From Swiss-Prot, chain A:
Subcellular location: Nucleus; Cytoplasm
Full-sequence range covered: 345 to 467 of 516
Descriptive protein name: SAGA complex/transcription factor TFIID complex subunit TAF6
Its biological purpose: Functions as a component of both the DNA-binding general transcription initiation factor complex TFIID and the transcription coactivator SAGA complex. Binding of TFIID to a promoter (with or without TATA element) is the initial step in pre-initiation complex (PIC) formation.
Summary of subunit composition and partner proteins: Component of the 1.8 MDa SAGA (Spt-Ada-Gcn5 acetyltransferase) complex, which is composed of 19 subunits TRA1, SPT7, TAF5, NGG1/ADA3, SGF73, SPT20/ADA5, SPT8, TAF12, TAF6, HFI1/ADA1, UBP8, GCN5, ADA2, SPT3, SGF29, TAF10, TAF9, SGF11 and SUS1.
Additional record remark: Present with 6506 (+/-1290) molecules/cell in log phase SD medium.
Similarity-based family: Belongs to the TAF6 family.
Domain statement: The histone-fold domain (HFD) is required for interaction with TAF9.
Lineage: Eukaryota, Fungi, Dikarya, Ascomycota, Saccharomycotina
Biological source species: Saccharomyces cerevisiae (strain ATCC 204508 / S288c)
UniProtKB/Swiss-Prot annotation, chain B:
SUBUNIT field: Component of the 1.8 MDa SAGA (Spt-Ada-Gcn5 acetyltransferase) complex, which is composed of 19 subunits TRA1, SPT7, TAF5, NGG1/ADA3, SGF73, SPT20/ADA5, SPT8, TAF12, TAF6, HFI1/ADA1, UBP8, GCN5, ADA2, SPT3, SGF29, TAF10, TAF9, SGF11 and SUS1.
Further facts: Present with 2360 molecules/cell in log phase SD medium.
Source superkingdom: Eukaryota
Location of this chain's protein in the cell: Nucleus
Protein name: SAGA complex subunit SPT7
Protein source organism: Saccharomyces cerevisiae (strain ATCC 204508 / S288c)
Part of the full-length chain shown: 152 to 187 of 1332
PTM: Protease PEP4 directly cleaves the C-terminus of SPT7(SAGA) to form SPT7(SLIK) within the SAGA complex in the nucleus.
Role played: Component of the transcription coactivator SAGA complex. SAGA acts as a general cofactor required for essentially all RNA polymerase II transcription. At the promoters, SAGA is required for transcription pre-initiation complex (PIC) recruitment. It influences RNA polymerase II transcriptional activity through different activities such as TBP interaction (via core/TAF module) and promoter selectivity, interaction with transcription activators (via Tra1/SPT module), and chromatin modification through histone acetylation (via HAT module) and deubiquitination (via DUB module).
Protein backbone atom coordinates (compact mmCIF):
# COMPACT_ATOMS: atom_id res chain seq x y z
CA UNK A 1 0.00 0.00 0.00
CA UNK A 2 2.87 2.38 0.75
CA UNK A 3 4.60 1.55 -2.54
CA UNK A 4 1.38 2.16 -4.46
CA UNK A 5 0.81 5.43 -2.59
CA UNK A 6 4.37 6.77 -2.91
CA UNK A 7 4.46 5.84 -6.60
CA UNK A 8 1.32 7.93 -7.14
CA UNK A 9 2.99 10.76 -5.23
CA UNK A 10 5.96 10.70 -7.62
CA UNK A 11 3.62 11.26 -10.57
CA UNK A 12 2.04 14.16 -8.66
CA UNK A 13 5.42 15.93 -8.44
CA UNK A 14 6.33 15.26 -12.08
CA UNK A 15 3.26 17.35 -13.00
CA UNK A 16 3.21 19.94 -10.19
CA UNK A 17 6.70 21.07 -11.32
CA UNK A 18 6.88 20.95 -15.14
CA UNK A 19 9.40 23.81 -15.18
CA UNK A 20 11.96 21.41 -13.67
CA UNK A 21 11.52 18.95 -16.56
CA UNK A 22 14.84 17.67 -17.96
CA UNK A 23 16.07 18.10 -14.36
CA UNK A 24 13.95 15.58 -12.44
CA UNK A 25 12.59 13.40 -15.21
CA UNK A 26 16.03 12.01 -16.27
CA UNK A 27 17.25 12.07 -12.65
CA UNK A 28 14.32 10.00 -11.35
CA UNK A 29 14.32 7.61 -14.31
CA UNK A 30 18.10 7.23 -13.85
CA UNK A 31 17.52 6.44 -10.17
CA UNK A 32 14.92 3.84 -11.12
CA UNK A 33 17.10 2.36 -13.89
CA UNK A 34 20.05 2.22 -11.47
CA UNK A 35 18.06 0.60 -8.66
CA UNK A 36 16.20 -1.80 -10.98
CA UNK A 37 19.12 -3.31 -12.92
CA UNK A 38 20.55 -5.74 -10.36
CA UNK A 39 19.93 -9.17 -8.83
CA UNK A 40 20.69 -8.77 -5.12
CA UNK A 41 17.67 -6.65 -4.12
CA UNK A 42 14.56 -7.61 -2.14
CA UNK A 43 11.18 -8.02 -3.91
CA UNK A 44 9.61 -4.82 -2.57
CA UNK A 45 12.32 -2.62 -4.07
CA UNK A 46 11.65 -4.22 -7.47
CA UNK A 47 7.91 -3.63 -6.99
CA UNK A 48 8.51 0.03 -6.14
CA UNK A 49 10.83 0.33 -9.15
CA UNK A 50 8.24 -1.13 -11.54
CA UNK A 51 5.45 1.04 -10.13
CA UNK A 52 7.67 4.10 -10.52
CA UNK A 53 8.21 2.96 -14.10
CA UNK A 54 4.42 2.68 -14.40
CA UNK A 55 3.88 6.28 -13.26
CA UNK A 56 6.15 7.47 -16.06
CA UNK A 57 4.89 7.56 -19.64
CA UNK A 58 5.82 7.17 -23.27
CA UNK A 59 9.09 6.07 -24.85
CA UNK A 60 10.84 5.92 -21.45
CA UNK A 61 8.75 2.81 -20.76
CA UNK A 62 9.86 1.66 -24.23
CA UNK A 63 13.37 2.50 -22.98
CA UNK A 64 13.00 -0.44 -20.57
CA UNK A 65 11.85 -2.85 -23.29
CA UNK A 66 15.28 -4.17 -24.26
CA UNK A 67 16.82 -4.77 -20.83
CA UNK A 68 13.77 -6.65 -19.50
CA UNK A 69 14.51 -10.03 -21.12
CA UNK A 70 17.89 -10.46 -19.43
CA UNK A 71 16.41 -9.06 -16.22
CA UNK A 72 13.80 -11.84 -16.28
CA UNK A 73 16.42 -14.45 -17.23
CA UNK A 74 18.52 -13.44 -14.22
CA UNK A 75 15.80 -12.84 -11.60
CA UNK A 76 13.49 -15.76 -12.50
CA UNK A 77 15.98 -18.49 -13.61
CA UNK A 78 14.60 -19.79 -16.91
CA UNK A 79 17.83 -21.68 -17.59
CA UNK A 80 16.67 -23.66 -20.60
CA UNK A 81 13.07 -24.06 -19.44
CA UNK A 82 10.20 -24.96 -21.79
CA UNK A 83 7.47 -22.97 -19.88
CA UNK A 84 5.72 -26.15 -18.68
CA UNK A 85 6.54 -26.69 -14.96
CA UNK A 86 6.46 -22.97 -14.11
CA UNK A 87 4.17 -23.37 -11.08
CA UNK A 88 6.71 -25.26 -8.93
CA UNK A 89 10.06 -24.50 -10.59
CA UNK A 90 11.36 -21.36 -8.87
CA UNK A 91 14.44 -19.30 -6.62
CA UNK A 92 14.72 -16.07 -4.65
CA UNK A 93 10.99 -15.33 -4.44
CA UNK A 94 7.83 -17.20 -3.52
CA UNK A 95 4.99 -17.95 -5.96
CA UNK A 96 2.72 -15.08 -4.87
CA UNK A 97 5.27 -12.30 -5.32
CA UNK A 98 6.42 -13.74 -8.67
CA UNK A 99 2.78 -13.60 -9.77
CA UNK A 100 2.67 -10.00 -8.52
CA UNK A 101 5.81 -9.23 -10.58
CA UNK A 102 4.45 -10.81 -13.78
CA UNK A 103 1.18 -8.92 -13.19
CA UNK A 104 2.85 -5.55 -12.59
CA UNK A 105 5.37 -5.87 -15.42
CA UNK A 106 2.45 -5.93 -17.89
CA UNK A 107 0.38 -3.47 -15.84
CA UNK A 108 2.87 -0.89 -17.15
CA UNK A 109 3.49 -2.59 -20.51
CA UNK A 110 -0.11 -1.92 -21.59
CA UNK A 111 0.73 1.79 -21.99
CA UNK A 112 3.17 1.12 -24.84
CA UNK A 113 0.68 -0.89 -26.95
CA UNK A 114 -2.40 1.33 -26.48
CA UNK A 115 -1.08 4.03 -28.85
CA UNK B 1 50.85 -14.35 -0.02
CA UNK B 2 48.91 -13.30 -3.13
CA UNK B 3 47.78 -16.89 -3.78
CA UNK B 4 45.05 -16.70 -1.12
CA UNK B 5 43.92 -13.36 -2.56
CA UNK B 6 43.79 -14.88 -6.05
CA UNK B 7 41.76 -17.80 -4.68
CA UNK B 8 39.43 -15.34 -2.93
CA UNK B 9 39.06 -13.52 -6.26
CA UNK B 10 38.24 -16.84 -7.96
CA UNK B 11 35.77 -17.57 -5.14
CA UNK B 12 33.82 -14.36 -5.88
CA UNK B 13 33.71 -14.45 -9.70
CA UNK B 14 32.96 -18.10 -10.55
CA UNK B 15 29.42 -19.17 -11.40
CA UNK B 16 26.40 -17.92 -13.29
CA UNK B 17 25.37 -15.13 -10.91
CA UNK B 18 28.36 -12.80 -11.37
CA UNK B 19 28.48 -12.69 -15.18
CA UNK B 20 24.74 -12.03 -15.39
CA UNK B 21 25.10 -9.22 -12.86
CA UNK B 22 27.83 -7.80 -15.10
CA UNK B 23 25.48 -8.16 -18.08
CA UNK B 24 22.90 -6.14 -16.15
CA UNK B 25 25.42 -3.47 -15.10
CA UNK B 26 26.80 -2.92 -18.60
CA UNK B 27 23.23 -2.67 -19.92
CA UNK B 28 22.55 -0.07 -17.23
CA UNK B 29 25.62 1.97 -18.16
CA UNK B 30 24.89 1.74 -21.91
CA UNK B 31 21.26 2.82 -21.52
CA UNK B 32 22.28 5.51 -19.00
CA UNK B 33 24.80 6.93 -21.47
CA UNK B 34 22.36 6.61 -24.39
CA UNK B 35 19.45 8.20 -22.47
CA UNK B 36 20.33 11.46 -24.27
Amino acid sequence: ALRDFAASLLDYVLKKFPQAYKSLKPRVTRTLLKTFLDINRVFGTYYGCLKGVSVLEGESIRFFLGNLNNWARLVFNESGITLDNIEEHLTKFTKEETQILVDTVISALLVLKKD
Amino acid sequence: LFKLDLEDLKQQISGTRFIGNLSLKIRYVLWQCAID
